[PDB]
């Protein structure tokens, strides 16, 4: 945004997740790399003058010092309290708990995702790889959902396994099998009856019986006009009204409900 606006530098932004280990860098990646800092000094001059006019320069310089004061620390030696000045690759006491909610894993299989997350991390440290390289979360969820018993099941999964899983198929299969056999290994009224008992119920019932021994005009102005029921009439040919009886509409009601549900075939 700062390049396209303040520097007027229209650029495609795809050389971020690229592999910067390769040598020599390609001509597009060399032009992209130099562009990240070529105009940043001109952008600095513009943004600084605006922070002075807006009286926000003090806050930016304060926040900048807090960014420069960040301290890297291993996850094993990280502080227990969350802080914005210390960084760790793992900032949670149980990182596999957010995977069980992300992929909807039953809480009874937490002992499985624990032993798989810890095994995946130790393997990543041994070969100096990322945990997603040896086993992404997509494959970690499949192993705990499908629970491959045999060694063939660990290899044949719909997404496809990594090479670390392919080599450790026997070790991983022995881990899910053992963790699943440990799951199968894992799997009142007398409180109030003694206070009042039975002979004392005759007291609370006798209390009841003699406590509650202490327990028509047609119309005045509108009582004989409002509670009137429905009266339906029909005009004959001579113009005289004819009141239908409440049993005639009863015939109509039961004749409709019976003839309504009596439809089970239409050509």
């Amino acid at each position: 945004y700062l390049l396209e606006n303040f520097a007027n530098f229209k650029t495609s932004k795809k050389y971020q997740l690229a592999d910067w280990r390769i040598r020599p860098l390609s001509k597009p990646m060399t032009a992209y790399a130099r562009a990240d800092t070529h105009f940043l000094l001109n952008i600095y001059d513009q943004l600084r003058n605006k922070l002075i006019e807006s009286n926000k320069l003090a806050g930016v310089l304060y926040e900048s010092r807090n960014v420069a004061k960040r301290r890297f620390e291993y996850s094993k030696y990280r502080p227990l309290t969350p802080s914005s000045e210390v960084y760790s690759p793992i900032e949670k006491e149980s990182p596999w708990k957010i995977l069980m909610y992300q992929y909807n894993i039953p809480p009874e299989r937490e002992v499985l995702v624990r032993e798989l997350y810890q095994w995946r991390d130790l393997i990543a440290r041994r070969d100096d790889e990322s945990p997603r390289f040896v086993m992404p979360n997509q494959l970690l969820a499949a192993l705990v959902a499908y629970t491959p018993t045999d060694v063939i099941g660990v290899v044949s999964l719909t997404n496809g396994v990594t090479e670390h899983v392919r080599q450790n198929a026997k070790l991983l299969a022995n881990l899910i099998r053992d963790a699943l056999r440990n799951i199968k290994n894992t799997n009142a009224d007398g409180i109030l009856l003694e206070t009042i008992s039975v002979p004392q119920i005759r007291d609370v019932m006798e209390r009841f019986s003699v406590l509650c021994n202490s327990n028509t005009n047609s119309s005045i102005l509108l009582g004989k006009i409002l509670p009137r029921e429905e009266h339906d009439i029909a005009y004959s040919k001579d113009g005289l009204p004819n009141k239908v009886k409440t049993e005639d509409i009863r015939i109509r009601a039961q004749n409709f409900k019976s003839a309504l549900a009596n439809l089970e075939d239409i050509i």
């Binding site: 003090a58 310089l61 309290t81 914005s84 909610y101």
Partner: protein, 181 residues
């Protein structure tokens, strides 16, 4: 409206605005000078939250993936879902939304204490309850004092004679309760 200085070599702070290479005041108070930070401290002012404050706040509403807690500042402070000690560790989904499940244990009007984890650009506070020390207050009575009348100290809460414990929130909210375990 009046001029505080005509020296361009200054860093303007609160109660102070820049205009025509000169510096003016926006409030009524005393001029402060710290290194190069020029600011004006007004007389009356609400609580200004900062990073790392043992405050006491009341829940206003249960919002989308967060809570609105009444700290006493210009705006409501936000308490994110991933910043508290959840009951069962995580959410038990799918069944209900995130907001409805929060009201089961943290409804509107509940009183608690937390620490300001960080600040937003507008000055809003971001709280967190990631320790056993912070929790939901009970077994006591609530009282309120001005935030400026809170002397700074190492300890935020203190034990008092008579089996009573005081929670002096730096935002002015105090919770007097019986001493707990």
């Amino acid at each position: 409206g009046e001029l505080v200085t005509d020296d361009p070599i200054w860093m303007r702070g609160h109660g102070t605005y820049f205009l025509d290479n000169m510096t003016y005041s926006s409030v009524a108070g005393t001029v402060s000078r710290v290194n190069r930070l020029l600011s004006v401290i007004p007389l009356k002012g609400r609580y200004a939250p900062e990073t790392g404050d043992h405050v006491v706040g009341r829940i206003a509403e249960v919002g989308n993936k967060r809570w609105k807690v009444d700290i006493g500042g210009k705006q409501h402070a936000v308490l994110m879902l991933g910043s508290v000690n959840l009951p069962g560790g995580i959410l038990r989904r799918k069944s209900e939304s995130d907001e409805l499940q929060m009201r089961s244990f943290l409804k509107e009007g509940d009183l608690l204490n937390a620490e300001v984890q960080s600040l937003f650009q507008d000055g809003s506070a971001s709280l967190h309850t990631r320790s056993l020390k912070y929790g939901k207050l009970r077994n006591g009575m609530f009282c309120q004092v001005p935030s400026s009348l809170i002397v700074r100290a190492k300890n935020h809460t203190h034990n008092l004679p008579g089996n009573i414990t005081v929670v002096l929130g730096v935002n002015g909210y105090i919770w007097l309760r019986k001493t707990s375990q």
